Amino acid sequence: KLLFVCLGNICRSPAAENIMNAQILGCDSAGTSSYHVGDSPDRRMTESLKRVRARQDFFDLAMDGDNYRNKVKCDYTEKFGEVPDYGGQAGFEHVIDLLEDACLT
């Protein structure tokens, strides 16, 4: 069982969970903050080409350094030189770009 973790579990780790599901030989996601528990993934992140409920476990992968530190593991990124978090749509595609590289299997 693989668990992908970001801060609110509405943008990054929900994307990681679906990318990994598609790449997989067959995931879940959650968040360090429970402020968004029960919400659907961010409307902008579901919108794309590119199929994406927030919940707040120690499973058999952190999106940024704050999620990770400061079984636990961008260090599977092989092509693109964190998975970045108040932005326009281009930042959402970059998140997907990084997860298609990193998504490890």
Author numbering: 2 to 25, 30 to 31, 36 to 59, 64 to 65, 68 to 71, 76 to 77, 80 to 81, 84 to 93, ...
What did the study's authors say about this model?
Wzc undergoes a phospholyation/dephosphorylation cycle that affects its oligomerization state and is dependent on the phosphatase activity of another protein, Wzb (Cuthbertson, Mainprize, Naismith, & Whitfield, 2009). In addition, Sll0328 was identified as a low molecular weight protein tyrosine phosphatase (LMW‐PTP; EC: 3.1.3.48) and Wzb homolog.
The structure of Wzb was solved (2.28 Å), revealing structural differences relative to other phosphatases involved in EPS production and suggesting a different substrate recognition mechanism. Synechocystis’ Wzb displays the structure of a low molecular weight protein tyrosine phosphatase (LMW‐PTP). The PTPases signature motif, the PTP loop, with the characteristic sequence C(X)5R(S/T) (cysteine 7 to serine 14) is located between the C‐terminus of the β1 strand and the N‐terminus of the α1 helix, at the N‐terminus side of the protein. Opposite and topping this loop, there is the DPYY loop, which contains the functionally essential aspartate residue (D124). The tyrosine residues of the DPYY loop form one of the walls of the active site pocket, with a histidine (H45) delineating the other side of the substrate entry site. (b) Synechocystis’ Wzb possesses an aromatic residue—histidine (H45)—in the catalytic site instead of the hydrophobic leucine that occupies this position in most prokaryotic LMW‐PTPs. Based on these characteristics, Synechocystis Wzb can be classified as a class I or eukaryotic‐like LMW‐PTP and is therefore likely to present a substrate recognition mechanism different from that of E. coli Wzb, a class II or prokaryotic‐like LMW‐PTPs.
